[PDB]
Design a binder for this molecule. Structure first.
Ligand SMILES: NC(=O)C1=CN([C@@H]2O[C@H](COP(=O)(O)OP(=O)(O)OC[C@H]3O[C@@H](n4cnc5c(N)ncnc54)[C@H](OP(=O)(O)O)[C@@H]3O)[C@@H](O)[C@H]2O)C=CC1
Ligand SMILES: [Zn+2]
Ligand SMILES: [Zn+2]
Ligand SMILES: [Zn+2]
Ligand SMILES: [Zn+2]
Lengths: 359, 359, 360, 359
């Protein structure tokens, strides 16, 4: 029964998937005398939290009742009493948090606030699942870095283009559509100029209710990206480019007026850990790296990736000097190559979709 | 009920695999009055035919009986009467064929020879299953060339070794063990000398009962193979080298004394179509092409393969100088790269086997 | 199938009211504004807020121009607070997805009618079968004015309840006993004959974890020969309604009533099943779990008054004529007049096999 | 791979099912130098044995070869040489048995006869699969009593008729048709005169594929069976009657003249135990007891059934005077009713088919 009520809280929480933007999905269940009297979930960014809806729905049955919450109740004494306090004043006797605040700084303030009020607080009930709920979000608060997803579509022999650099549709139609989805679940999309220049890619999640365009990030060491690129122009979604001192001053103040946020790095070459640091500062909590063989390589030798997604089409491109899946410096020795782990294998159309994760 | 007996025949047929060599696997069942009176499969090479075994067993019950054969009964007059004529004499009144002879000048010949004696003949029953069974052989007999299977193991990102050639631990032990099956269903294992230089493998079948062993085929352009390589000294299996006129006649000597057979081609380079044709006139019908990013490339560029099987491990070898699955030429435009079709997506241990075929 | 997803969700939310509601049906609602799930609700406590109400509130302004999926046709009647249908009209909602209509044919379609007048597109159907299973009993009691009748028994593989002597110590496994106990939780009453009382002195209560308002213990007497001794009488754990005839003894009747036992006397010398179910139906009993009496089960099958059969067969053979079979009594003489049922479930609880079936 | 061969030998044996009738199911597979060259199965009663077939099919490959049998090689020295010999004469190195001949007397002779000829004898391989293959034969040979299967059809409330004896629509045509199958997997059908005097059956499996009608056995204490009954006049099959000294002499003759075997038991009442003993002494190894709630009673009361089948219908008959499934005495105390065990619960049409076995 304990875990039951918590499972429900989870299921409610999930209903708000893709509706909170940069807020954590959350659910809550108010049980009273062995009867569910209140249920709730964070449904829309900036609107009522999950503990609120539930409490309200439970009304007078809140007092002397329990309340299962997926994540630790809000505890800032901001512009309104916090959900941690709102739980207090409602007369709830026992609270069942699943997992604590992601922010090392706040973690516990909620549990404390309540516990010192006489509320019995139990933690960890199904916290194993109350973890999967918001991977990307929890990663960000725990590591201050965005959640990186590396994606690519390649031939069966790991070539993302032919000798000519021609990528005239390696993967099928169904593949694109699928891959598109990720452009909606990530705060940003990232590519290296080597792609940009040779594709003028839009990089705009063209899915259902977009209600928020992802930041388009380009990596350019000497800032050579042409001004006739849909990312430079078409002011659809934001466009940030990272570069070194090597960029032209005028071109920089130019495109900077066009809305393009140019970030300059004081290093010889652009260092991935540095751009993921910047981004986490500009509030981005996730990046969808899908650009260039070289960019995918720097991301690998660095270890800056949480997820790997490759689309493999029934076709052999071949060619020794044809761009391969991952480039970069690589790993000279096999004993130094880290061990990933296949997460999921699913066939999209005639193509195959392999997905893996670290350790 | 027709497919029950035709399926019994298919399972009997298979009880002789790898005991016929360049001959077809055939199963035969004689049903009398709703009762199985005789079973048979082609067991040894150059020995009794499945129809022979089954009809003898069937004895006098052969008369007024039926018989389900997985392949048009032998209809030529050699040392012994053909099986079709053998059917005709036993008094069988009905024959069920799964498929006609792969040879054009023989197909349907036995069928009519039988009809001709008042025998009612049906066909197609479990045609596909009957196809799959002698798949390689069928190809060989229809195309005149060996059935070619390409096989390689690479990290998830298609690399088959690092920038330094280090390829230790790319395929799990569970894998090698699986891939070892093809060393039992193919009449030859081929690799370039490069593979002999890099890993000096025995290329032998090391599965449980391993009666016979496949012919180890190495493509060594200028006979630079190392005279001390296992493939040249273990005597565990045959070894055939394919070289050009640039080889050393005195080395071919030293090597022939070892039991290896050295084919000397006339072209400057080595054409896969060339060796493939010789392997066939030699009775070799199936070829399992293992190592050789370049070798695989030739077989592919020449379109000389029937099945691709790649093992992918949850690892990422970076590498701007790393060897990918297929090297060499390579198609210049996507509008030319041939479309394959995944036939199976099996997960082996923490690894993953992808197998696909052309067209 | 995005519609069905939202309706499936609604259904799921409704199941959560499985406990508190008593008579009131389980209902789930979900409001969606521009592909987003703005509000969720369900009927959680008898006499309190209806499903639609909760979800519509939690939706706020989003309600305006949204769609709402309800597992049952919305309120249409006017009494204390505004009817859920009127609430939907007023909230903005441009379209409703109703799974099934109201059971009481006196109301059936009244809500749908109303919302339609207000220009709300009403799409009926989505997952009706499911919405039907959610209140299988409630609906029956509503569409037929009679309780839901579940008959349960446990016999030997050859259909016996005891041996030639009456022994029956180990006829059905403990796993079976327990599995059969869950129904005591899903019914509003348990029916049993007098024989079973005077022969087992049963508690006919629910021991399964988490119980609220014990079911009504209903005993079919005749000449009121039930022992004042104990259990259904002294055991003051749950209500006990005894049905008697004229033969009953006056003194004894008001003696049992001196406790809290309710007594119903009929004007016939043979407790007729249909009469009992009707009295129960009137008294507000939407469901009966008749496990008692070999004969008790007989009346219920002859009169044809049962919507579910649950027979537990142990892997034992008792045999012997004169051994008490499953259903004693009148039965059916000619075969032509034997009703055909339908096996709805074949499970295996421990050593025994639990067979269940329902009418044509 | 020693279990492969035995498992294979098992399948081949199953191909003889319901053809060997009185004989058991054996499967002989001869292997040499790592490859099958022999396969056989007992296909027809009074004909070649599983070994005989695999030998001759192995010929000279039998010299210094193995051979797997499912049942201890025959030793009945007579008309031809005991298979024990063919195994030695053919020059067989090793021999494998899955189990020993269940026949008390010859439950060693075969294993030995070759064992002393010097051949290594490994036995017990896949003995459970080889046990299930001849569940009925095994029983008979071990206990000296036939395999007894009881069958009955009834309403869900355990009735076999209405209070007025009506029983027109109990089990659907599916269950009745399923019921038939047994009629051919048994050597005889047991039923009491009541059944004859009641339904005057033909007691023959109508299903077209029978070249050996089962023995019709009637238990009739005082010989009151109708003289013009199908079971006597239609002489489509053998008809055995078990009666007592109360049987009217003249009538015994009248019936026996019709070619009906009358066994007059020496007791006053028919004892299933005696009847069974007598039946085995005549060849019958199996018996399928249908009719007789009275007869079933006996068989149960004596504990003379290795298996029982009950077909239930989705109907409630009811009736304090309606005939129960098992009639007669029955067990007086629950601490005395044997415990069976459910073996299969497969539905047939609207009916359900319950099957359980002893201890
Ligand atoms: N099928 C698929 O999944 C995809 C295929 N492609 C195709 O594959 C190929 C991939 O492009 P590729 O040329 O390898 O290059 P990339 O798109 O990875 O761009 C590489 C360039 O970006 C800059 N860059 C990359 N990594 C870093 C780093 N770590 N730090 C600083 N700067 C960095 C450098 O710019 P500079 O040196 O100029 O300063 C470098 O030359 C193309 O032919 C493209 O068309 C592209 C995307 C997806
Ligand atoms: Zn909060
Ligand atoms: Zn032939
Ligand atoms: Zn309502
Ligand atoms: Zn034998």
């Amino acid at each position: 029964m304990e875990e039951y009520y918590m499972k429900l809280a989870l299921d409610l929480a999930k209903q708000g998937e893709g509706q909170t933007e940069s807020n954590p999905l959350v659910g809550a269940v108010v049980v009273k005398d062995g009867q569910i009297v209140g249920m709730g979930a964070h449904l829309k960014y900036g609107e009522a939290h999950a503990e609120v809806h539930a409490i309200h729905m439970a009304g007078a049955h809140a007092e002397g009742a329990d309340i299962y919450v997926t994540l630790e109740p809000c505890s800032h004494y901001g512009k309104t009493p916090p959900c941690a306090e709102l739980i207090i004043n409602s007369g709830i006797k026992r609270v069942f948090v699943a997992m604590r605040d992601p922010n090392p700084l706040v973690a516990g303030r909620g549990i404390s606030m309540m516990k010192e009020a006489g509320i019995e607080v139990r933690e960890g009930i199904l916290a194993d699942q109350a973890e999967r709920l918001n991977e990307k979000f929890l990663h960000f608060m725990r590591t201050g870095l965005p959640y990186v997803t590396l994606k690519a579509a390649a031939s069966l022999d790991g070539k993302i283009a032919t000798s000519t650099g021609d990528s005239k549709w390696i993967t099928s139609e169904a593949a694109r559509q699928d891959a598109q989805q990720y452009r909606k679940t990530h705060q940003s999309i990232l590519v290296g100029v080597g792609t940009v220049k040779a594709d003028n890619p839009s990089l705009t999640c063209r899915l259902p209710n977009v209600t928020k365009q992802p930041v388009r990030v380009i990596l350019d060491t000497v800032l050579s990206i042409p001004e006739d690129a849909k990312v430079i122009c078409d002011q659809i979604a934001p466009t940030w480019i990272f570069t070194t001192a090597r960029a032209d001053e005028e071109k920089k103040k130019r495109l900077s007026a066009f809305g393009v946020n140019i970030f300059t790095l004081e290093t010889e070459r652009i260092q991935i850990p540095d751009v993921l640091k910047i981004l986490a500062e500009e509030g981005i909590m996730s990046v969808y790296v899908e650009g260039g063989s070289a960019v995918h390589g720097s991301f690998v030798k660095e270890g800056c990736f949480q997820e790997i997604i490759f689309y493999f089409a029934p076709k052999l491109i071949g060619g020794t000097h044809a761009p391969s899946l991952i480039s970069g410096e690589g790993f000279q020795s096999m004993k130094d190559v880290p061990l990933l782990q296949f997460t999921d294998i699913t066939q999209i159309g005639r193509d195959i979709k392999l997905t893996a994760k670290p350790t």
